[PDB]
Amino acid sequence: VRETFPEATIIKPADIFGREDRFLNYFANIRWFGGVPLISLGKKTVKQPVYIVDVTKGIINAIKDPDARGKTFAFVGPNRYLLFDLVQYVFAVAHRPFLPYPMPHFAYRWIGRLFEISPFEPWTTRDKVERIHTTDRTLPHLPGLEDLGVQATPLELKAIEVLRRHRTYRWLSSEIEDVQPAKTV
Amino acid sequence: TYKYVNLREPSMDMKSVTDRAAQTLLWTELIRGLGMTLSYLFREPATINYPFEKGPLSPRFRGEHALRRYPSGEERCIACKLCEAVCPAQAITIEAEPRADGSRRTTRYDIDMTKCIYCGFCQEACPVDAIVEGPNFEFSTETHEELLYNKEKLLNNGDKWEAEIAANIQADYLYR
Amino acid sequence: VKQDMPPVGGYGPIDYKRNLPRRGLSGYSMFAVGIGALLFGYW
Amino acid sequence: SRGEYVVAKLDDLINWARRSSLWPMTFGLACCAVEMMHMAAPRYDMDRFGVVFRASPRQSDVMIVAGTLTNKMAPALRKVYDQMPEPRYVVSMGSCANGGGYYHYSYSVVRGCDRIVPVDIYVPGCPPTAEALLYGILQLQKKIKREKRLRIWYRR
Amino acid sequence: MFMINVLTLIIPILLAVAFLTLVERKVLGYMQFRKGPNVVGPYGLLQPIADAIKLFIKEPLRPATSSISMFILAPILALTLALTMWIPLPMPYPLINMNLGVLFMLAMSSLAVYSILWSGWASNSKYALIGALRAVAQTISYEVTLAIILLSVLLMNGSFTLSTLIITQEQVWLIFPAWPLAMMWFISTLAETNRAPFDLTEGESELVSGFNVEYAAGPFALFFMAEYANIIMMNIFTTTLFLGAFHNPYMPELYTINFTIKSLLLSITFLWIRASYPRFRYDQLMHLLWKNFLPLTLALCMWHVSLPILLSSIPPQT
Amino acid sequence: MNLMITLLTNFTLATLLVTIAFWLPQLNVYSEKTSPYECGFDPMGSARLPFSMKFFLVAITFLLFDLEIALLLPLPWASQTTNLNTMLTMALLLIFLLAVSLAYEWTQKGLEWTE
Numbered sequence: 001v002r003e004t005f006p007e008a009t010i011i012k013p014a015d016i017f018g019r020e021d022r023f024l025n026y027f028a029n030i031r032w033f034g035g036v037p038l039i040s041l042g043k044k045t046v047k048q049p050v051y052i053v054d055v056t057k058g059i060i061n062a063i064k065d066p067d068a069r070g071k072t073f074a075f076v077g078p079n080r081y082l083l084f085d086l087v088q089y090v091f092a093v094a095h096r097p098f099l100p101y102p103m104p105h106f107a108y109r110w111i112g113r114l115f116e117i118s119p120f121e122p123w124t125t126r127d128k129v130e131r132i133h134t135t136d137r138t139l140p141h142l143p144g145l146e147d148l149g150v151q152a153t154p155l156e157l158k159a160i161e162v163l164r165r166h167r168t169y170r171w172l173s174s175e176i177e178d179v180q181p182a183k184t185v
Numbered sequence: 186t187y188k189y190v191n192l193r194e195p196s197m198d199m200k201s202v203t204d205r206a207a208q209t210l211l212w213t214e215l216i217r218g219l220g221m222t223l224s225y226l227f228r229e230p231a232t233i234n235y236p237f238e239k240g241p242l243s244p245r246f247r248g249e250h251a252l253r254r255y256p257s258g259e260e261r262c263i264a265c266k267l268c269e270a271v272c273p274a275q276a277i278t279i280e281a282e283p284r285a286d287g288s289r290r291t292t293r294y295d296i297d298m299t300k301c302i303y304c305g306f307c308q309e310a311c312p313v314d315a316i317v318e319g320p321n322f323e324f325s326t327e328t329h330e331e332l333l334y335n336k337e338k339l340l341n342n343g344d345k346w347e348a349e350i351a352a353n354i355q356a357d358y359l360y361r
Numbered sequence: 362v363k364q365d366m367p368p369v370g371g372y373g374p375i376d377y378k379r380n381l382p383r384r385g386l387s388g389y390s391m392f393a394v395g396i397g398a399l400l401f402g403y404w
Numbered sequence: 405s406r407g408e409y410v411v412a413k414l415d416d417l418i419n420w421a422r423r424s425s426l427w428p429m430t431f432g433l434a435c436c437a438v439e440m441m442h443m444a445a446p447r448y449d450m451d452r453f454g455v456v457f458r459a460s461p462r463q464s465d466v467m468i469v470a471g472t473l474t475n476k477m478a479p480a481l482r483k484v485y486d487q488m489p490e491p492r493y494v495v496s497m498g499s500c501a502n503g504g505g506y507y508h509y510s511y512s513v514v515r516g517c518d519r520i521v522p523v524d525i526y527v528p529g530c531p532p533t534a535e536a537l538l539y540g541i542l543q544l545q546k547k548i549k550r551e552k553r554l555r556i557w558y559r560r
Numbered sequence: 561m562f563m564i565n566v567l568t569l570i571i572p573i574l575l576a577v578a579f580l581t582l583v584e585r586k587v588l589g590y591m592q593f594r595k596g597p598n599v600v601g602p603y604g605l606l607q608p609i610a611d612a613i614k615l616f617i618k619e620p621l622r623p624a625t626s627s628i629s630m631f632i633l634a635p636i637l638a639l640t641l642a643l644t645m646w647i648p649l650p651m652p653y654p655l656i657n658m659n660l661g662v663l664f665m666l667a668m669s670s671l672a673v674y675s676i677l678w679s680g681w682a683s684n685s686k687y688a689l690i691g692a693l694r695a696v697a698q699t700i701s702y703e704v705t706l707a708i709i710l711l712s713v714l715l716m717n718g719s720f721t722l723s724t725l726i727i728t729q730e731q732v733w734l735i736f737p738a739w740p741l742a743m744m745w746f747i748s749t750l751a752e753t754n755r756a757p758f759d760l761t762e763g764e765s766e767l768v769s770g771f772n773v774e775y776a777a778g779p780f781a782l783f784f785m786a787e788y789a790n791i792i793m794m795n796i797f798t799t800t801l802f803l804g805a806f807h808n809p810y811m812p813e814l815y816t817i818n819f820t821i822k823s824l825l826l827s828i829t830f831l832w833i834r835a836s837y838p839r840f841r842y843d844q845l846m847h848l849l850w851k852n853f854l855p856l857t858l859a860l861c862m863w864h865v866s867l868p869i870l871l872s873s874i875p876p877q878t
Numbered sequence: 879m880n881l882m883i884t885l886l887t888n889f890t891l892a893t894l895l896v897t898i899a900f901w902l903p904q905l906n907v908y909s910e911k912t913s914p915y916e917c918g919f920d921p922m923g924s925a926r927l928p929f930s931m932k933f934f935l936v937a938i939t940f941l942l943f944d945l946e947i948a949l950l951l952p953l954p955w956a957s958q959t960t961n962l963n964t965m966l967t968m969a970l971l972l973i974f975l976l977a978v979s980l981a982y983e984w985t986q987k988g989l990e991w992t993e
């Protein structure tokens with residue numbers, strides 16, 4: 001695209017979380033199949049998810065801004081979390097029992113092979129497995145959401161909005177603040 | 186000048202008391218209601234077989250709007266804007282200018298069919314019988330913007346339904 | 362002139378009062394029928 | 405080959421079974437509700453076409469917006485539409501639900517119900533006649549017949 | 561070859577349930593000056609098929625505030641209770657000959673209420689709880705009078721076996737010596753099956769849809785065929801009790817066709833009752849079976865205890 | 879043995895239709911579809927509040943009358959006895975005691991609902 005459109009604006013989001021996402025919903029739906037397996041307990045990968053509304057505002061501002069022509073932005077969230085405590089915060093928001101267990105890398109690929117033979121939309125696949133356990137790289141040389149006038153909103157103000165539908169009747173009316181927030185790096 | 190509905194005291198006679206006891210025990214009026222419904226089962230149902238049959242209508246019917254022409258090709262509207270001033274819902278927008286031969290005609294004549302209350306004031310305020318409310322009523326659309334008629338759509342409706350609107354006006358015009 | 366009018370003698374009669382048939386037998390007939398059926402069934 | 409034939413037959417089957425079993429919910433607001441229940445009268449009798457009322461939103465298929473949608477009514481209409489299970493269809497009746505009608509410039513009237521719910525068929529009139537509403541229902545049935553959902557799934 | 565017998569019992573009853581929905585919609589059309597479904601097929605013979613296919617491709621919609629275990633368990637219990645209801649019914653040979661079949665119907669009638677109660681309770685709704693408590697009140701209204709009517713009728717039969725009810729009225733119909741018991745039995749089964757004028761549970765006017773106001777398609781269809789199987793077998797139960805037919809052991813098809821015609825006429829009368837009367841209150845029904853039916857039933861039970869002693873007409877228990 | 883086969887056949891017929899009604903169609907589940915239905919508006923309080931019942935006395939006497947008719951069901955077999963007069967007297971006396979209890983509740987306004 002860059003070589004065929006020299007004036008194209010390329011936007012590179014990290015990971016989107018929202019009401020109809022497949023990032024927090026995937027973690028909140030994995031609880032059906034057991035106890036949320038991870039690779040090396042999920043404490044070797046770092047994620048910085050970004051809210052969907054902020055990505056939309058950045059896209060709109062990049063449409064309006066004349067200086068965004070030819071740029072290559074990197075839309076990332078305001079905080080970096082390890083995968084283990086990110087899944088822990090997701091399950092603590094959903095008020096679900098959290099019992100993680102390790103899984104080897106070769107064992108997880110065979111699990112992703114089994115789920116991706118479905119003729120409908122697969123629940124998970126090996127590509128989703130490798131992208132879930134991939135550390136989000138840092139690119140300081142690229143402009144971000146702050147250069148387009150969009151203030152990044154953290155996951156703590158929208159995670160309940162995303163994951164309230166995954167709670168049972170007992171914990172449906174719990175408030176904002178009665179969940180210990182995640183630990184950053 | 187008035188009547189006493191439901192002031193009928195009962196009769197204390199023992200024969201009628203026994204008759205009322207028999208009605209209570211054996212449910213006379215309940216079987217009466219059953220018999221009325223059973224007799225209503227064996228009638229011709231009033232269902233007309235739509236779309237192969239249509240309900241009755243009158244020549245004064247108010248349906249879809251149309252723009253008529255004189256019997257020479259010239260359109261009847263003269264941009265007098267009486268319809269847009271008498272319209273209770275402000276559904277008519279008219280813009281006018283003299284055309285190439287100096288005749289007072291319109292350049293824009295829009296009727297918003299989603300604002301129109303179908304009261305037929307425009308068809309009776311027109312001094313030349315240009316705008317009419319034809320007999321068409323099966324014109325439901327799948328989109329909101331398909332119900333926003335401009336001058337071309339109204340003229341097409343007039344050319345489509347002239348063979349009927351002319352006869353309906355011929356049948357009705359002596360009452361107006 | 363031509364107009365909608367009633368006829369010279371007016372229209373015909375139109376009913377407006379309650380007309381319920383008040384059918385059925387007497388209560389004694391119903392009780393006798395029931396007792397007869399009961400005794401026949403018993404025998 | 406054979407898979408396209410099979411999914412076309414399955415699409416035809418489910419389209420017939422969905423279009424011949426439309427259950428609208430008992431929902432009216434105004435004059436147009438009286439005209440809708442006049443369509444449900446023995447003269448026209450929409451029960452012939454498999455169209456029978458079901459009061460609960462959970463057991464209904466098509467929502468008929470008949471009447472004026474005011475500002476106090478819009479959250480209730482939106483909530484009732486959300487509680488209706490997929491697939492769901494919306495039919496707009498009268499000028500009030502189409503574009504506000506007589507009360508377009510009113511301070512407390514939503515200018516058309518399409519600002520709240522996705523509308524499939526717009527039935528014009530004030531009130532649209534019972535034949536017009538039956539025509540709109542038959543148009544919705546013919547629209548349902550032209551759905552190629554399993555064909556789209558097989559092609560994607 | 562018992563599984564073939566079970567399948568050939570359980571499939572035609574639900575086919576007849578679907579066609580009873582068809583016939584009920586047609587009769588409920590034709591009494592009210594209009595027609596039934598006659599557009600989908602030839603005289604509307606394909607309407608139950610379209611309804612059944614439609615209800616199984618719609619969204620399941622389990623609520624978030626509802627306890628999911630009882631929410632799924634209740635329609636399964638309703639359909640299974642309606643399906644095992646039919647087992648000891650002699651047409652003229654029952655699937656399972658039982659010494660005490662009448663008490664089995666009574667116990668399963670007690671059990672089938674719990675599907676309504678738990679479907680009302682599990683779905684976290686106020687209207688559902690209202691419908692559940694109305695079902696509770698309806699059951700405590702009707703059950704005593706139902707059991708004592710059936711007790712005072714079976715005293716002339718000699719045993720609780722349903723096949724003996726064919727032999728015990730091979731001379732004359734049992735509707736003759738127990739015509740008042742027949743009328744109160746018919747009213748009691750009208751109240752049992754939650755049909756008009758004693759609906760009071762799936763009220764579309766006092767409530768919106770009753771205990772299944774949150775149940776979307778599929779699970780709701782289970783309650784629909786459970787209720788229609790209930791009304792068909794309850795008319796069949798009444799036909800066996802009071803309208804026994806001529807039975808030839810060499811040609812059972814005569815009894816089958818006679819019994820089928822009588823039960824169909826009873827279901828036609830059932831839909832006839834449906835489209836004639838306003839619905840009762842749910843406390844006026846309680847004042848009906850207790851203040852009007854129960855004293856007369858106690859008197860009739862005295863009469864039907866003393867009468868076989870009176871006329872030396874004690875039926876055999878073998 | 880045949881009754882358990884019949885019950886199991888009915889149960890796996892019932893649970894087959896539910897299991898194919900939950901996995902077959904396409905689902906679009908949001909945090910608005912599964913809200914409780916309160917005629918279009920938000921409910922004012924929980925559905926687990928105490929729903930007070932007015933017919934408590936009728937329920938208690940339903941228990942007592944259910945047990946009275948439970949005692950009364952051996953009558954078709956008890957009519958096959960030799961001591962026929964004593965059986966007839968005890969049956970009549972039990973039913974008369976049932977009617978006496980019902981009449982005492984009727985005269986004391988026990989069947990009338992509270993409030």
Ligand SMILES: CCCCCCCCCCCCCCCCCC(=O)OC[C@H](COP(=O)([O-])OCC[N+](C)(C)C)OC(=O)CCCCCCCCCCCCCCCCC
Pocket residue numbers: 209210211212215216392395740742743744746747757798833837848852853856
């Ligand atoms: C299956 C075979 C056919 C079954 C028959 C029924 C089919 C037709 C059904 C018709 C429609 C019914 C729709 C539902 C109606 C519900 C309401 C209802 O019925 O309420 C019951 C009504 C209630 O009446 P009510 O509601 O008016 O009560 C008034 C109450 N107060 C006064 C307090 C306000 O009737 C009864 O309770 C009577 C029950 C039957 C009595 C039978 C008596 C038989 C004869 C005895 C002897 C008489 C002679 C005298 C003594 C001689 C002694 C030797």
Ligand SMILES: CCCCCCCCCCCCCCCCCC(=O)OC[C@H](COP(=O)(O)OCCN)OC(=O)CCCCCCCCCCCCCCCCC
Pocket residue numbers: 410413414416417420599600601606608609612613
């Ligand atoms: C590998 C090989 C097999 C491949 C898979 C496919 C197998 C077959 C699938 C079922 C049948 C598919 C075809 C469905 C009909 C297609 C033609 C059609 O749409 O005809 C339309 C016509 C009605 O026309 P209409 O537009 O409604 O007219 C208005 C009235 N003037 O319609 C009619 O006149 C009537 C249409 C009737 C449709 C068939 C009957 C109902 C379905 C029966 C089978 C499924 C259900 C089985 C039982 C389930 C449990 C109850």
Ligand SMILES: CCCCCCCCCCCCCCCCCC(=O)OC[C@H](COP(=O)(O)OCCN)OC(=O)CCCCCCCCCCCCCCCCC
Pocket residue numbers: 657658659660661664879880881882885
């Ligand atoms: C979590 C919720 C619940 C989930 C599970 C639900 C399971 C199904 C529930 C519905 C069925 C309940 C059945 C309860 C017992 C019924 C007994 C019965 O039907 O008896 C009838 C019959 C009587 O026989 P008789 O008249 O003496 O004649 C034989 C002489 N030749 O008897 C016979 O003919 C005898 C036949 C063999 C009997 C074997 C013993 C009974 C087996 C019971 C199995 C377990 C039932 C569990 C029910 C749970 C209900 C909540």
Ligand code: SF4
Pocket residue numbers: 268271272273274275276277296300301302303304305306307308318
């Ligand atoms: S019928 Fe009435 S509301 Fe409609 S355009 Fe004419 S004047 Fe306006």
Ligand code: SF4
Pocket residue numbers: 261262263264265266267268269279310311312313314315316
């Ligand atoms: S009233 Fe008639 S002539 Fe006048 S502007 Fe309207 S359509 Fe034209």
Ligand code: SF4
Pocket residue numbers: 434435436470471472497498499500501505506529530531532
């Ligand atoms: S469109 Fe007309 S008939 Fe319908 S509700 Fe509005 S004012 Fe009444």
